Every structure is written in C-alpha cells, then in structure tokens.
C-alpha cells in the first residue's frame, strides 16, 4: 500500500484536477522548511502559493510552533457560549479591534472564512428585519469574486462552476468585475470604466430597490478570482453610492488582511472605510482554523441593540473563539507586524514587480498585475486580441504540473498564473521562483504553439 494508493482509495478530493492526480499520484507532504515543503519520497518544493495564501510565516516558524505548544500546555480546548470564554479569546478581540481601522467595535468568531461570510449575511438579515425591513435581504458581490464554499458564500462567489450545485441561490447579484484590462471597452479609459461601474451599481439599486438590498461585499484585491487589483478610484466611486442608499459595505480581508497588499488591510491600501471586516487565513498563518467578523462602530451599535431586543444571538460554531486558535492569532499578528514579515513585503514588492514585467514580455502573456506579495500573469493564445487558449489544451494544468516537476508549487486559477509566496521569502528564493516559473512557461508554450 503506497501513499499514492492509500490517498486514492479513501479520499474525496476537493479542488483537485482528477486526471492529473490519477496520472501523477497524490503528492503526500510530511513537513517543510521556510517556504519549502518536502514529500514522502524526499522530493522538495518551493511553495510559491503559501500553501493556500495563508502560510505567510513558512512551514516551520519556530516562534509560532512554540506559541501553539504553550497554549496546548495551558488550556487545549473550549467554547464561547453561555457566558463563558477563554482569557485568550478576550485578548484577541481586544487586539483585533485595535489593529483594525475602526476606533471601536465587536468581534464574532468562526472556523473558516466561508463561515464568516455566511455569518455576516445572517447578521445582515437579522439586523434589517429587526430594524423593520424583513425584505432587505439581497446580497451584492462581483463577478470573479470569491467569498467561500457554503451554499450562501458560494452564491456570493462569481464563478461558472457553482452551476453544478444549482447556485447561486435567489438573492445574490453579481456586478461587473473591476478588471479594466478584461472588461474595459473599445477606446474606454480607466476613469470612464470606473464611472460605468458606479453607474451600473446605481442602476442595480434602482432595479431592485434599496429596501431589498442587505449588503455589498468586496475583496479589496480579488484573490482566488486570479489576483485582480481594482481599477483606480473604484472604491472611491463605489462607497458613496452605498452610503446614499443605506447598504452596508463589507470588506472581505480574508487574503488582504495583515500584509499581502503592502498594508495591514486592503482597505488601507485602497483608502476606503468599510462598515465591517471579514478576516481569516493569515490570521493564524495557517497554524489553526480561525475566522473573524469585525463590526465597525455603527454596525456594532446596531447589532448589539437588535440583540438585546430579543435576548440572544442564536448563532455560533462549536469551536468558535478557541483558546488555542486565539493564542496563535495573537502570535501571528505579532510576528507579521512586529517581527518584520509585513515590512519584508513592502521592501521586496519592487523587485517582484520587476520579475513579472520581465516575464510578461513574451507572446503568450497578456499582462501582469497585482501588488505587494500577490501577483498574476495572464496566459493568452493571441496577445493583441486577448484571446485565451482552448479549454482542451488544459494550459492551466500543464503549467501547474510542469512547475511541480521543476520543484515549484505554483497554482494557476484559470489561465491566471498566480504567485503568492510566504512573507519570509528571501531575494534568493524569489529568484528561484522566477527562474523555475520561466522554464515551465518556455516548456509549456512550446508544447502548445
């Protein structure tokens, strides 16, 4: 019984290309060092995807390892219901409101980012109903958005593949993605593009009626949708319209939270104030499953009041507010902001951007894009016309597979080659990643020209 065999026999794989995994075998990982992972055959890889955006401190950070173990020595498990919670919970809440852009606020916990978005929607429904508008339920997101995998968070996610579940559910509207390169019109400037989306939102609000719309969620920079920075002035045009019609604005900071963008929050980087923040991933540097909904002052007041009218918030997850996870997050927050990880991103962003600009030079890259330590190259069959490769060429898989074969974990989402390495990444490691990526590109584009 090999590892590959055992894996195939018992696993139902999620987000796994099945013809790749049948033909190649599951890669079974035993440990890591810095930004490297090592499999059971001893084969070693530079994971330029931070595992899954979240391992910003690498795969063996001593401080974080030591922090987790200490909390298990102290108090290994508990909950946050019935008027009881850990000291460690009370601590993170306090810490989180502080690092947040809000002056004061409140914090509710989940296990995943998906749960947090799901919770956020329910909070909105609860809130508008208690404030006299039970019909105020619709949820606005963007095409290419990714907000998670529960029925609701998947309805929030703007991707063709949710049709296999018969989603989105009624009440979830997808507006145009602010990706200027893809969706900008013949001879339309970036400013004209941003004005068209401001206009498109208002039309939607007119079409549906503000009294039926409960919220607007946005990632500051779109992550799993393939690293899409917003067109210039998007949030500046977008927010006032939402204030005008009394539509809560929620910032999904699950990827942008704590550093990847060049700041503590994506909404800092793009200079807007949300009514609430959804945080996860980096929150624990992938050491423990944690999610957080951070309500800004206005929603905090309103939710709090709404609760006391009824006497209980009948919502919550078994492991939410976990002593271990809260401890880890404190340490992770401290490590990122005070032990140089976030600054490392700001420092190396210029060089990272220089590498991609060099790489984008060839016939089959349409553009490069991103910010800080989150970036993507777009593969095209024809550059002038912007036309993608045929589905049957499986260009995405070829690139992933070839990268893996050269010792580089790089995961393309669609025809968007994504790079989101840990923050602990050294200039030499960054060179390693580029050199490996380039070879992969040469090989694949020549197979496929």
Ligand X SMILES: [NH3+]CCCCC(=O)O
Of residues 69-98, which lie at the interface with a second copy (CB under 8 A)? Answer: 69, 72-87, 89-90, 93-94, 96-97
Nearer to ligand X, 120 or 254 (CB): 254
If one counts every other C-beta atom within 10 angstroms of the C-beta of residue 176, the result is 16
Residue entry with tokens 């006032």: 240
Q: Which is nearer to Na ion, 94 or 427 (CB)?
A: 94
Local structure of residue 205 (DSSP, 8 states): H
Q: Does 227 bind a second copy (CB under 8 A)?
A: no
Decide: 388 and 379 in contact? Cβ < 8 Å. Answer: yes
Which does residue 165 touch among a second copy, Na ion, ligand X, none (CB within 5 to 8 A, set by kind)? a second copy
Site for a second copy in 287-316 (CB under 8 A): 287-289, 293, 295, 300, 303-304, 307-308, 310-316
Nearer of residues 110 and 231 to a second copy, judged by Cβ: 110
- Tell me which residues in 39-58 interact with ligand X (CB under 6 A): 52
* The pair of three-digit structure tokens given for residue 312, joined into one six-digit string: 């209980």
Q: What is the DSSP letter of 61?
A: -
413 binds, among ligand X, a second copy, Na ion, none (CB under 5 to 8 A by kind): ligand X
If binding is defined by CB under 8 A, does position 15 make contact with a second copy? yes
Interactions with a second copy, residue window 94-123 (CB under 8 A): 94, 96-97, 105-109, 111-115, 118-119, 121-122
Beta carbons of 290 and 111 less than 8 angstroms apart: yes
Q: 10 Å Cβ neighbour count for 406?
A: 17
Q: How far is the CB of 171 from ligand X (least distance, A)?
A: 22
What contacts 24+ positions apart, CB below 8 Å, involve 358-366? Answer: 359/434, 359/437, 359/438, 359/441, 362/441, 362/445, 363/445, 364/441, 364/445, 364/449, 365/441, 366/181
Six token digits for residue 114: 């998906």
How many residues at the interface with a second copy, by CB under 8 A? Answer: 126
Read out DSSP for 149-208? SSHHHHHHSB-GGGGGGT-SPTTEEEEPP--HHHHPPTT--HHHHHHHHHHHHHHHHHHH
- Please provide the DSSP assignment of 231-285 as one string: PTTHHHHHHHHHHHTT--EEEE-TTTTTSTTSSS-HHHHTT---SEEEEEGGGGT
Our finding on whether 111 is near Na ion (CB under 5 A) is no
Q: Is the dihedral of CA 307, 311, 313, 318 positive or negative?
A: positive
Q: Residue 103 or 186: which CB sits closer to a second copy?
A: 103
Examine residue 100 and tell whether it contacts Na ion (CB under 5 A): yes
* CB of 102 or CB of 352, closer to Na ion: 102
Structure tokens at 128: 């508008």
Task: Identify residues 391-420 at the interface with ligand X (CB under 6 A).
Answer: 413
Part in contact with a second copy (CB under 8 A); list of ranges 49-57, 195-203, 365-373, 436-444: 49-57
Cβ closer to ligand X: 224 or 380? 224
Rounded to a whole number of angstroms, the minimum distance from the CB of residue 224 to a second copy is 10
Helix or strand holding residue 437 (H, E): helix 427-447
| Residue with Cβ nearer Na ion (97 or 213) | 97
- Which residues 302-331 are close enough to bind ligand X by CB under 6 A? 318
Structural element, H or E, at residue 354: helix 341-359
Q: State the Cα–Cα distance between residues 238 and 352, nearest whole angstrom.
A: 30
Candidate segments 17-25, 225-233, 343-351, 381-389, binder of a second copy by CB under 8 A: 17-25
Select from Na ion, ligand X, a second copy, none the partner in contact with residue 130, using the beta carbon and a kind-dependent cut-off of 5 to 8 Å.
a second copy
Q: Does 322 bind a second copy (CB under 8 A)?
A: yes
User: Scanning residues 195 to 254, which ones bind ligand X (CB under 6 A)?
Assistant: 224
Closest CA relative to residue 330, chosen from 374, 275, 276, 290: 290
Cβ of residue 413: shortest distance to ligand X, in angstroms? 5
Token pair of 226 as six digits = 């393939």
389 near a second copy, judged by CB under 8 A: no
* Chain residue whose CB lies nearest ligand X: 224
Residue ranges in 126-185 that form contacts with a second copy under rule CB under 8 A: 126, 129-130, 134, 137, 148-152, 154, 159, 161-162, 164-166, 169
The residues, ordered by sequence, that sit 6+ positions from 186 with a Cβ below 8 Å of its Cβ are none
Partner touching 100 among Na ion, a second copy, ligand X, none, CB below 5 to 8 Å by kind: Na ion
Residues that bind ligand X (CB under 6 A): 15, 52, 224, 318, 413
């Amino acid at each position: 019984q090999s590892w590959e065999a055992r894996a195939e026999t018992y696993s139902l794989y999620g987000f796994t290309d099945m013809p790749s995994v049948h033909q190649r075998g599951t890669v079974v990982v035993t440990h890591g060092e810095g930004p490297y992972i090592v499999d059971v055959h001893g084969r070693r890889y530079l994971d330029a995807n931070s595992g899954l955006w979240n391992m910003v401190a690498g795969f063996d950070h001593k401080g974080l390892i030591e922090a987790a173990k200490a909390q298990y020595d102290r108090f290994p498990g508990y909950h946050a219901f019935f008027g009881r919670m850990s000291d460690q919970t009370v601590m993170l809440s306090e810490k989180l409101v502080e690092v947040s852009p809000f002056d004061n606020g409140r914090v509710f916990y989940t296990n995943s980012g998906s749960e947090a978005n799901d919770t956020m929607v329910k909070m909105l429904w609860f809130l508008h109903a208690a404030e006299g508008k039970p019909q105020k339920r619709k949820i606005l997101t963007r095409w290419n958005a990714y907000h998670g995998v529960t029925a609701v968070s998947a309805s929030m996610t703007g991707k063709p593949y949710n049709s296999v579940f018969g989603l989105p559910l009624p009440g979830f509207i997808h507006l145009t993605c602010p990706h200027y390169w893809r969706y900008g019109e013949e001879g339309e400037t970036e400013a004209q593009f941003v004005a068209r989306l401001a206009r498109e939102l208002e039309d939607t609000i007119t079409r549906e009626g503000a009294d039926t719309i409960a919220g607007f969620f946005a990632e500051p920079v779109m992550g799993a949708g393939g690293v899409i920075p917003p067109a210039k002035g998007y949030f500046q045009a977008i927010l006032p319209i939402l204030r005008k019609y009394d539509i809560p604005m929620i910032s999904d900071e699950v990827i942008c939270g704590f550093g990847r963008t060049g700041n503590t929050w994506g909404c800092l980087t793009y200079d807007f104030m949300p009514d609430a923040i959804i945080s996860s991933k980096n929150l624990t540097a992938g050491f423990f499953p944690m999610g957080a909904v951070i309500l800004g002052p206005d929603l905090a007041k309103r939710v709090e009041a709404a609760v006391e009218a009824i006497e209980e918030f009948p919502h919550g997850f078994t492991a939410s507010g976990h002593p271990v996870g809260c401890a880890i997050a404190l340490k992770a927050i401290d490590v990122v902001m005070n032990e140089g990880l976030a600054e490392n991103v700001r420092r190396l962003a210029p060089r990272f951007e220089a590498g991609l600009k060099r790489i984008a030079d060839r016939p089959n890259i349409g553009e490069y894009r991103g910010i800080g330590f989150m970036w993507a190259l777009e593969a095209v069959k024809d550059k002038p016309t912007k036309t993608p490769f045929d589905a049957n060429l499986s260009v995405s898989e070829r690139i992933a597979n070839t990268c893996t074969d050269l010792g580089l974990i790089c995961r393309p989402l669609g025809q968007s080659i994504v790079l989101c390495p840990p923050f602990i990444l050294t200039e030499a490691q960054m060179d390693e990643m580029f050199e490996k990526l380039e070879k992969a590109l040469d090989k694949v584009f020549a197979e496929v020209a």
